[PDB]
């Protein structure tokens, strides 16, 4: 009974494009990029009232965030950046902005056919991560 209902469920990574370079731009070192780049994370999205929870389990790291749309929160990312995060819903698309050390990256999640498509942008580096229902 929510707009994020399209996103609710368990999703598994099925394809990746340009992710190594996105990780490099975000400050991930060589060894961490090599290991992290092998991973096939899941994405588990749930809603309880106004609280949205996004969990990611993988060999690299398990993470979990809970948030209210529009409200900034602290996040420690899978690659150990300590960031200030705001997530909003803009015309059906979940838009996640992460700010740290004067830098910023945007991760958008959208439903496209049976897929959940994730676009990751840092400066002029864009990566696409495609998920399907688990």
Ligand X SMILES: CC1(C)[C@H](C(=O)Nc2ccccc2-c2ccccc2)[C@@H]1C(=O)O
Q: Which is nearer to ligand X, 1 or 22 (CB)?
A: 22
The yes or no reply on residue 32 touching Cl ion (CB under 5 A) is yes
Instruction: Dig out the tokens for 25 from the structure.
Output: 């731009």
* Of the residues 11, 25, 56, 75, which one makes contact with ligand X according to CB under 6 A: 56
The yes or no reply on residue 29 touching Cl ion (CB under 5 A) is yes
x-or-dash string of contact with ligand X, 28-47, rule CB under 6 A: x-------x--x-x------
Instruction: Dig out the tokens for 109 from the structure.
Output: 């999640």
Q: Which is nearer to Cl ion, 39 or 93 (CB)?
A: 39
Q: How far is the CB of 50 from Cl ion (least distance, A)?
A: 27
Sign of the alpha-carbon dihedral angle for 72, 132, 91, 5: negative
**Footprint on this chain of ligand X (rule: CB under 6 A):** 13, 23, 26, 28, 36, 39, 41, 56, 58, 60-61, 77-79, 107, 118, 120, 129
């Amino acid at each position: 009974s929510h707009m994020c209902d399209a996103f609710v469920g368990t999703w598994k990574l099925v394809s990746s494009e340009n992710f190594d370079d996105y990780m490099k731009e975000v400050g991930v070192g060589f060894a961490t990029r090599k290991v992290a780049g092998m991973a096939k994370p899941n994405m588990i999205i749930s809603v309880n009232g106004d609280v949205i929870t996004i969990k990611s389990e993988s060999t690299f790291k398990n993470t979990e965030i809970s948030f209210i749309l529009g409200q900034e929160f602290d996040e420690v990312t899978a690659d150990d950046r300590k960031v200030k995060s705001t997530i909003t819903l803009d015309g059906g698309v979940l838009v996640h902005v992460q700010k740290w050390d004067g830098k910023s990256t945007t991760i958008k999640r959208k439903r496209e056919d049976d897929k959940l498509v994730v676009e990751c942008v840092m400066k002029g580096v864009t990566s696409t991560r495609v998920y399907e229902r688990a």
